[PDB]
């Protein structure tokens, strides 16, 4: 019940240097910045996007154990609740494994449980509402408005246990389920979403009966399950990719063949094929509308986590055509 209304809050990274995040998102993507003797932290984001980047200042800190194992990565996906203690006690009664019991600081009551791999979920309760946006330009074309979802690579044979956790413990709903096969490789994608609709996790499981792919590379190079990419809803995906490209952001490629045969599959209503081809944006549709997605290259030293831009017209979930296309694009840039 305290869990029923949970909303996506901040995404905490552990990083070796706060300036790697600054150079990446602030200087590259144009996000704003808003900055315990064991951790140095800064906040980066805009509108509804809120990242906390923390670099440990001592070896005896969880962030040092993280960066050693994974490098820079997502270590905690915080969930805003109206009551952090009540949400904690309910989730633990449901099976959740506690990481930190409820404690109050100044403007937050927090309680952390474990999530996929070694990534935490902190329940966070604010006294007067969530912090204000770091920067605001929601009405600007190409603006990055919110985090639409997260992609999570899981070890083979751990997908259904991950799904059961978020559904049984956290009450998420299953909104997508398909096994994707491309060439001699295959995967299983199951997307779970909070009843509030703001917390969406696409769970990806490699198919070990096939040949290995970039899913298998991530799991091996990251060091287990973790966030593969983070998707930013964009106030117009053609303009968001255009501006980012002018700032030095490199995106994954999609051959011209994709756009030559596109109108026999879908007729994009918002954009033209030349626009889509130029920016390398992928389009799909379902019963309610169309969906546009694109992946940015990973700038991570291990080539693991990367970023996605998405714009929804009527499409409220995920399409199998974009999922298949987005796999190929990621498979072409790394494995
Ligand atoms: Cl709250
Ligand atoms: Cl990256
Ligand atoms: Fe995605």
From TrEMBL:
Fe(3+) binds at residues 149, 308. Its EC number is 1.13.11.27. Keywords: Dioxygenase, Metal-binding, Oxidoreductase. This is 4-hydroxyphenylpyruvate dioxygenase. It comes from Amycolatopsis sp. Hca4.
